RNA sequence: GUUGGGUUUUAAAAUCGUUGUAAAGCAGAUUUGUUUAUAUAUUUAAUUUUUGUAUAUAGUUAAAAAUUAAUAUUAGUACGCAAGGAUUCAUU
RNA sequence: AAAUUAUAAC
């Protein structure tokens, strides 16, 4: 977590003498370089220069603006100051897309050009669709997007849930989970989501209900050799002398006895995609999950990792709202051996030997 | 470095890139459990608050001078250097990311004052190749005829920024004559007032340029007037420094040598030649005082 | 409790094992092994447990210093067809060292070849005995 | 009922009806501005706007660059997003894999 | 007060991995991180030409495997010849460059491997071998610059 | 071609008894192991550091060099591996006759007439060994 | 043993925990010179 | 990762999921064959009713079967029914085979060498045009 | 954890030095000790005056 | 920097020193500034 | 002055009070505010600028030695499989 | 080469 702090900077130090560009005071009608001069002159405190015209604030600024209208290329990185980016358009530091609901189909093993051997897990993304959007009272950033999966007969769900899919008109889905999207990542209800929504190299987070183990002891749940102290603040004797100490008289919260052992909601938050099969709507991940086959796994993107945004300048940039296909792109025209999109090598070197 | 080809970067130069996804190392990624709610892909926008995003519905926050709700109280600096409508959060809740609803209104950039349009200005190309103290470094970076004082013959608009060098030397950078007037009859009145003028002479005769330091004169007025200094510059103008009650030699040298930089940059604006100070016998013989 | 390990949300506890037939699984792994033999890293095979056992293997195995050229007898044939499972479990008797080993049979750098002329099953039986002896009599007892 | 837990089984329904009252007390004030003088101070841009912030590029006390990110959302775009159809993805955006191994600035 | 821990020093020189259905060794034959790093006096075979018994060489350190990284172990090893010649002593402490092991160690390419007998070669304090010739087939994991630039890199690897 | 260039390099720095062996196709892993008899520990370090540069401009792959411990220093060119031993320490070990005697490592090596012939082995020591069977 | 320096607790968060052991004639009834959180 | 997140040694549950993976420690008998004799809870098995031992479990199963071949009905209790309807069909998948070994495959199981003939006499002519699930399993509204 | 809770080995507040002996609350939960000046086991850890700095010598 | 930096306001090169004490009613006026005196 | 070696605390526990652990069997939907057994930051090997500095050689960073986890809004006394892993593979 | 281990592993 050390090396995870951004550049520290307070608020009492964002003043005129620190801004990278001309510090701009607000005056109602328009910005300006000088402080607002109070209208009632009786307010003006002693030794407070109500500057009507300063040259240095007006000269340094004058050369600045002229140089940007005349030499755009050199002063490129100073064009977001006065021309801010619009809304939508996939800001990289701000936009969070939505994921989709996949089903664990099977497992296999793949190999890169290098002699490496991966343990692949084919996830099937059957029939995803944005079934509705929701916001907590129109608050900011509290947006959500629910995505159904696996169209099903109406005779399947209970009434009180099928009646919900009979609200937004979408086909009655098998299940639908929700992802917190940014208001720029929205899409109209019903957008048939393709699997190509994901790119074959991004680090994708999944969440699922791992395999149920019933009721196991300690040797299986937390099986260890020895421990259970977390003694912490409670006093104890070292270096005898003034000694009266206290000990435990209750099973402190968070002990480690027997329990359920695993019907919870697991979360892998760094799995990189391996092979997007966009004919069969399959995604392969080079990891084995401890989940029963047939589970539903909600896919997201690892928004950032190791310190760098996922959809940054260098690496690819996603199909932002979603992946909309063409008009003539009929996947049924091509065999499953053509609708494949493999990945770059995940390892820099053959992992039986060492780094050259 | 290289052709940016990520394959031809490893296979050729062996620039091993840090494992990004499948490594066994930490893979620094906070906010995995500590941050409840929508997290934006901006990396560490919540790491000084204690890696949480819970609060900040609240407008008020403990603020030292200049921070959030300190904008009503008066404080000289932030009253001339901070838009009051700009005061944000407190001292550790600094906003590395702020998201608000509502349309965006861009109050236009402020235009320029006292520039009659349709007056094409000549421009100065400032460069670091210049010595950074040359007089061409303090002239305005855009020269308007609206700013050239013509009543006195001046080609370019006068400078607007002055060097911050605390001058403890004197010289004839563009002076022509520095006289002082004192009174030996003066005994009690202004003991220190005389103690400064005479001292400024003893600290003026040690001026800094290859001139004969006898550009300085010392007159004995029997007028019984408080000692007064008169400095006249090459072009002719005279500067009478103010000898107030409680001003010593070290103060005067900063007075004149500032009004002697403006006089130089006024003369350099009037077409007078430039006597550039440089290393001659005084940047030495003062280098030994080390 | 303060922890609630199990979670009974309708999303998690559901199972999509009813509609899997709408996804042709075994039809895919063919079209996924077929891609592997279309690539360099495999050749189609239809062995039958009796057929492979005892048959000699050429190997090669890439690796950085030089390829490992090693000759040995097959003994398992884990898959019996060209599926991605593969597997061989050869014995390979290189030198004074004996080395039973497994070949995933899809690896680019782990390439080999099997031949079926001297792979008479009645030769496999001897190789099986040769290993047990080397196995049992190397226990540092 | 922890103290900090009873303070919120009370104030959370109040914090709701408070801020939603301010938003109402804005439309009255913005509509009053609309009938009032159009081009005036009237406390910033009156018509449901958030004065864009110009001052978000700083050089902190340790002489290094510090950027303040600030984003707004026009209620029209996010409303056009939710009823219109996005654009077709460019063939070069999905056929080019998101490459692993984030290149340095080499 | 609070007998916080006894021996406490095996935990600094052993690879102890809890058994909790997730952390667990396994028999090998599953994937990298095979298991059982061979931690006790195991009486490895010597193979290089010396009077090391070539049938017995008793172990010292409590860890031996490459998924445990024999590539930086400094694995000490004591020589216990049941007979040497009736040139080393039967009582010295040489390092060892482990070659192979009967335990089926799965490689990072699925290539399982197990040999007839776990063997190794004695070497010195500067990581130079003590023999001239080696009579066995070493493992790929002996390719590091750690045990290469003095190791003859005897012959055919695996 | 490349193996001969290493000889036109070392032989300039006054290396003696330089012997190359095309050990390829034989039991070893490298394909051309060479041997050099330099005198001083420094004289072993130069020839080590000298062949590195030749492995920097023509065969640019010059990943690494080591610091010290140059009694018997070894420098590989990957598969053309150059040994540089002191004047001594060669009347001990092979210098030849382990790779100049090793047969061509061909197939059909399945327990020939008792393999305990080892003219490359019996040249240096005895090395008892028992051939096995299903016996 | 010899129970010395009683402590009369008034409430909490309004007694400062140094004034508890106050009301005893000593060097207490002053301000703790170096407090720990 | 490369090793499954759970090793070989871990018991899943009753009514668990399949959770497919590679493993090499199964198939004790000629599994899936008309006399598999495997008994457990995970679906690929027969429900292990309460018997005093695995051997005594077979003896129960044998004498439950050779009472379905005399009286073509039976009133069993608990988990003997599912593991008899399953075994009642195995006998009939074994009747149509009729090879010289089936009757020696079925003479080993039943405590009766007569019923084997009746089994092999009726069931071909009787279950010829029925694919599978030859035995009915009606749950009675009563209880012991 | 920002809320904190990293208490020391016991002491809460320590008053001024007053020569060799410096006070301390030693808040924990009780005491027992002794005392060089009059040695009697003295439960009253709420206040223990150490000697120069040796926690061995008290009150 | 060294700590909380406060820059006292500055003027042009020429209007900096010896500003004219020219007022309007109780107000220091100048072409550039205004300040109650 | 006679004089001093000892330092430590138990052997069948239906838990039977609190305790914590798990749980009340399908919720379309983690997470405005509770509460954090959550736990390490480094002993190694091999490189990349053995170059800075000194007569010998740093200092940074990366590859390798192992498993990731989210609580409470819906009708109930069979097997949560009609079981031999297919939500009836053909009818009886 | 033996009947044993420990095994608190299916």
How would you summarize the topology of this molecule?
This is part of a larger assembly, with 10 protein chains of 10 kinds.
Chain A: E1 25-26, E2 31-32, H1 55-70, E3 100-110, E4 118-124, E5 129-135, E6 143-149, H2 159-165, E7 175-179, E8 203-208, H3 218-221, E9 266-272, E10 275-277, E11 282-285, E12 296-299, E13 304-305, E14 308-309, E15 340-341
Antiparallel strand pairs in A: 1-2, 3-4, 3-12, 4-11, 5-6, 6-7, 8-9, 10-11, 10-15, 13-14
Chain D: H1 3-6, H2 8-35, E1 49-51, E2 57-59, E3 65-67, E4 69-73, H3 77-81, H4 91-94
Antiparallel strand pairs in D: 2-3
Chain I: E1 13-14
The structure holds 2 RNA strands.
Walk me through what this model shows:
This is part of a larger assembly, with ten protein chains of ten kinds. With 356 residues, chain A is mostly beta strands. Chain A contains three helices and 15 strands. The longest helix of chain A is centred in the N-terminal third of the chain and has 16 residues, at 55-70. Chain A is extended. The relative contact order of chain A is 0.16. By secondary structure, chain C is of the alpha+beta class. Chain C has three helices and three strands, in the order ααβββα. Chain I is largely without helices or strands and 59 residues long. The termini of chain I are far apart. Chain A binds two RNA strands through residues 2, 131-132, 134, 136-137, 139, 142, 144, 146, 148, 157-162, 164-165, 173, 175-178, 180, 207-208, 210, 215, 219, 222, 227-228, 230, 249-262, 264-271, 348-349, 351, 354-356. The PDB classes it as ribosome. Keywords: ribosome, Mitochondria, Kinetoplastid. The entry is titled "Intermediate assembly of the Large subunit from Leishmania major mitochondrial ribosome". Chain A is Ribosomal protein L3-like protein.
Précis, in short:
By secondary structure, chain C is of the alpha+beta class. In chain C, 24% of the residues lie in helices and 10% in strands. Strand 3 of chain C pairs antiparallel with strand 4 of chain E, so a sheet runs across the interface.
The main β sheet of chain D shows up as: 2 strands, antiparallel
**Biggest β-sheet description of chain I:** none
Share in helix of chain D: 25-40%
Distance between the termini of chain D: 57 Å
H and E order of chain D: HHEEEEHH
Would you report the number of β strands of chain I?
1
What structural class do the secondary elements of chain I suggest?
little secondary structure
Strand content of chain D: 5-15%
Q: What's the number of helices of chain D?
A: 4
Major β-sheet strand ordering of chain D: 2-3
Quaternary state of this entry equals part of a larger assembly
Instruction: Please report the two chains with the greatest interface, counting residues with C-beta closer than 8 angstroms to the partner's C-beta.
Output: A-B, 81 and 72 residues
Note the run of SSEs of chain I as H and E. Answer: E
Please compute the radius of gyration of chain I using only Cα atoms: 13 Å
Number of helices of chain I: 0
End-to-end CA span of chain I: 36 Å
Protein name (chain H): Putative 50S ribosomal protein L17
Family (chain H): Belongs to the bacterial ribosomal protein bL17 family.
Organism (chain H): Leishmania major
């Amino acid at each position: 977590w050390y090396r995870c702090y951004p550049s520290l900077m307070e608020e009492k130090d964002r003043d005129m003498y620190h801004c990278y560009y001309p510090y701009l005071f607000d005056h109602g009608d328009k910005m300006s370089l000088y402080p607002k001069i109070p209208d009632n002159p009786r307010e003006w405190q002693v030794e407070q220069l109500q500057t009507t015209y300063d040259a240095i604030r007006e000269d340094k600024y004058d050369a600045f603006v002229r140089l940007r209208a005349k030499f755009p290329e050199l002063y490129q990185d100073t064009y977001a100051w006065d021309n801010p980016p619009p809304f939508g358009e996939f800001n990289m530091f701000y936009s969070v897309r939505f994921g989709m609901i996949g089903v664990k189909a099977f497992t296999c093993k793949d190999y890169d050009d290098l002699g490496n051997q991966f343990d692949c897990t084919a996830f099937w993304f059957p029939d995803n669709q944005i079934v509705k959007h929701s916001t907590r009272n129109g608050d900011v950033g509290t947006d959500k997007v629910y995505v159904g999966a696996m169209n099903v007969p109406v005779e399947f769900h209970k009434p009180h849930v099928a009646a919900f899919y009979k609200a937004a008109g979408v086909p009655v889905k098998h299940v639908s989970a929700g992802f917190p999207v940014t208001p720029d990542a929205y899409a109209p209800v019903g957008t048939k989501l393709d699997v190509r929504h994901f790119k074959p190299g991004q680090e994708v987070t999944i969440t699922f209900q791992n395999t149920d183990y019933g009721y196991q002891g300690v040797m299986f749940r937390h099986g260890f050799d020895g421990g259970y102290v977390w003694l912490g603040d409670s006093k104890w004797q070292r270096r005898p002398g003034c000694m009266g100490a206290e000990g435990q008289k209750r099973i402190y919260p968070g002990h480690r006895m027997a329990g359920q052992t695993g019907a919870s909601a697991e979360t892998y938050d760094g799995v990189p995609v391996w092979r997007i099969d966009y004919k069969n709507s399959l995604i392969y991940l080079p990891t084995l999950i401890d989940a029963d086959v047939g589970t539903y796994v909600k896919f997201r993107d690892t928004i950032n990792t190791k310190g760098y945004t996922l959809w940054n300048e260098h690496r690819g940039t996603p199909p932002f709202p979603t992946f909309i296909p063409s008009e003539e792109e009929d996947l049924s025209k091509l065999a499953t051996d053509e609708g494949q999109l493999t990945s770059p090598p995940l390892y820099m070197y053959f992992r039986d030997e060492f780094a050259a | 470095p290289a052709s940016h080809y990520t394959f031809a970067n490893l296979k050729k130069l062996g620039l091993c890139a840090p494992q990004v996804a499948l490594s066994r190392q930490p893979r620094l990624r906070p906010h995995v459990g500590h941050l409840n709610g929508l997290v934006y892909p901006l990396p560490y926008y919540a790491m000084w608050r204690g890696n949480h995003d819970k609060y900040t519905y609240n407008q008020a926050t403990p603020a030292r001078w200049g921070e959030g709700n300190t904008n009503t109280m008066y404080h000289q600096h932030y009253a001339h250097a901070k838009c009051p409508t700009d005061y944000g959060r407190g001292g550790r809740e600094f906003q590395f990311l702020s998201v608000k609803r509502g349309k965006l209104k861009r109050k236009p950039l402020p235009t320029v004052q006292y520039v009659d349009p349709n007056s094409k200005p000549q421009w100065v190309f400032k460069s670091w190749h210049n010595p950074l103290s040359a007089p061409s470094m303090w002239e305005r970076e855009v020269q308007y005829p609206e700013h050239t004082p013509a009543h006195t013959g001046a080609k370019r608009p006068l400078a607007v920024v002055a060097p911050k060098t605390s001058h403890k030397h004197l010289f004839l950078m563009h002076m022509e004559k520095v006289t002082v007037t004192v009174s030996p009859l003066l005994f009690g009145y202004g003991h220190t007032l005389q103690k400064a003028a005479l001292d400024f002479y003893r600290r003026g005769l040690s001026a800094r340029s290859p001139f004969p330091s006898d550009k300085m004169f010392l007159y004995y007025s029997i007028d019984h007037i408080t000692p007064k200094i008169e400095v006249t510059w090459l072009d002719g103008s005279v500067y009478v420094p103010p000898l107030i009650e409680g001003v010593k030699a070290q103060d005067l040298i900063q007075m004149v040598m500032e009004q002697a930089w403006l006089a130089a940059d006024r003369m350099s604006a009037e077409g007078r030649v430039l006597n550039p100070i440089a290393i001659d016998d005084y940047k030495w013989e003062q280098l030994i005082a080390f | 409790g303060y922890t609630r390990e199990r979670t009974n949300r309708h999303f998690f506890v559901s199972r999509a094992n009813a509609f899997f037939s709408r996804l042709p699984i075994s039809r895919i792994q063919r079209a996924l092994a077929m891609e592997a033999i279309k690539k360099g890293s495999m050749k189609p095979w239809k062995h039958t447990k009796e057929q492979i056992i005892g048959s000699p293997i050429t190997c090669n195995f890439e690796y950085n210093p030089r390829p490992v050229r090693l000759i040995g007898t097959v003994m398992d044939a884990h898959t019996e067809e060209t599926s991605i499972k593969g597997g061989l479990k050869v014995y390979a008797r290189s030198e004074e060292a004996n080395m039973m080993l497994w070949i995933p049979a899809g690896n680019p750098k782990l390439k080999y070849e099997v031949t079926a002329a001297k792979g008479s099953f009645e030769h496999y039986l001897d190789e099986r005995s040769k290993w047990d002896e080397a196995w049992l009599t190397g226990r540092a007892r | 009922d922890s103290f900090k837990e009873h303070y919120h089984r009370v104030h959370l329904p109040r914090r709701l009806a408070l801020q939603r009252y301010i938003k109402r007390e804005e439309a009255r004030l913005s509509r009053h501005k609309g009938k009032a003088v159009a081009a005036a101070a009237a406390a910033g841009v009156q018509p449901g706007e958030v004065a864009y912030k110009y001052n978000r590029w700083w050089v902190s006390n340790d002489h290094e660059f510090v950027h303040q990110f600030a984003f707004v959302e026009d209620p029209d775009v996010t409303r056009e997003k939710r009823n219109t159809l996005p654009l077709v993805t460019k063939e070069n955006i999905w056929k080019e894999p998101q490459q692993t191994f984030f290149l340095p600035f080499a | 007060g609070n007998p916080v821990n006894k021996t406490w020093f095996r935990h600094n020189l052993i690879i102890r991995r809890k058994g909790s259905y997730r952390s667990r060794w396994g028999n090998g034959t599953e994937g990298y991180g095979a298991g059982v790093p061979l931690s006790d006096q195991v009486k490895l075979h010597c193979v290089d030409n010396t009077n090391c018994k070539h049938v017995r060489l008793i172990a010292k350190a409590t860890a031996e495997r490459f998924a445990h990284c024999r590539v930086f172990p400094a694995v000490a090893h004591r020589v216990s010849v049941q007979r040497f010649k009736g040139r080393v002593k039967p009582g010295n402490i040489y390092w060892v460059c482990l070659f192979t092991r009967r335990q089926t160690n799965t490689r990072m390419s699925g290539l399982q491997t197990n040999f007839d007998r776990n063997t190794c070669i004695i070497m010195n304090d500067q990581r130079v071998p003590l023999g001239t010739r080696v009579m066995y087939c070493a493992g790929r994991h002996v390719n590091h610059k750690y045990h290469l630039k003095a190791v003859v890199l005897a012959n055919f690897f695996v | 071609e490349d193996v001969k260039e290493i000889a036109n390099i070392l032989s300039s720095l006054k290396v003696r008894d330089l012997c190359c062996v095309d050990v390829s196709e034989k039991t070893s892993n490298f394909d051309y192991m060479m041997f050099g008899t330099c005198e001083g520990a420094r004289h072993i370090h130069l020839a080590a550091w000298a062949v590195q540069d030749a492995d920097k401009v023509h065969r640019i792959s010059k990943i690494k060099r080591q610091q010290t411990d140059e009694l018997w220093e070894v420098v590989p060119v990957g598969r053309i591996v150059v040994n540089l031993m002191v004047e001594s320490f060669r009347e001990e070990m092979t210098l030849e006759r382990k790779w100049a005697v090793t047969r061509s490592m061909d197939p059909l090596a399945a327990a020939n007439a008792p393999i305990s012939e080892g003219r490359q082995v019996k040249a240096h020591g005895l090395w008892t060994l028992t051939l096995n069977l299903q016996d | 043993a010899a129970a010395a320096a009683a402590a009369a607790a008034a409430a909490a968060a309004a007694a400062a925990a140094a004034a508890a052991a106050a009301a005893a004639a000593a060097a207490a009834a002053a301000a703790a010179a170096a407090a720990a959180a | 990762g490369r090793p499954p997140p759970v090793m070989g040694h871990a018991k899943r549950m009753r009514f668990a999921g399949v959770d497919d993976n590679p493993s090499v420690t199964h198939k004790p008998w000629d599994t899936s064959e008309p006399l598999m004799a495997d008994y457990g809870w995970e679906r690929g098995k027969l429900p292990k009713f309460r018997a005093r031992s695995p051997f005594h479990r077979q003896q129960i199963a044998r004498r439950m079967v050779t009472e379905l071949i005399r009286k073509d009905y039976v009133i069993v209790g608990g988990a003997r029914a599912p593991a008899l309807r399953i075994l009642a069909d195995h006998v009939v998948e074994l009747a149509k085979a009729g090879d010289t070994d089936s009757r020696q495959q079925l003479a080993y199981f039943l405590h009766d060498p007569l019923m084997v003939d009746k089994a092999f006499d009726e069931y071909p002519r009787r279950f010829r045009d029925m694919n599978a699930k030859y035995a009915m399993m009606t749950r009675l509204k009563g209880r012991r | 954890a920002a809320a904190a809770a990293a208490a020391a080995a016991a002491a809460a507040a320590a008053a001024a030095a007053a020569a060799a002996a410096a006070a301390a609350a030693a808040a924990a939960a009780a005491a027992a000790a002794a005392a060089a000046a009059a040695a009697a086991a003295a439960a009253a850890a709420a206040a223990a005056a150490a000697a120069a700095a040796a926690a061995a010598a008290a009150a | 920097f060294q700590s909380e930096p406060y820059f006292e306001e500055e003027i042009e090169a020429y209007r900096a020193h010896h500003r004219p004490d020219v007022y309007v009613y109780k107000y220091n006026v100048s072409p550039t500034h205004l300040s109650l005196r």
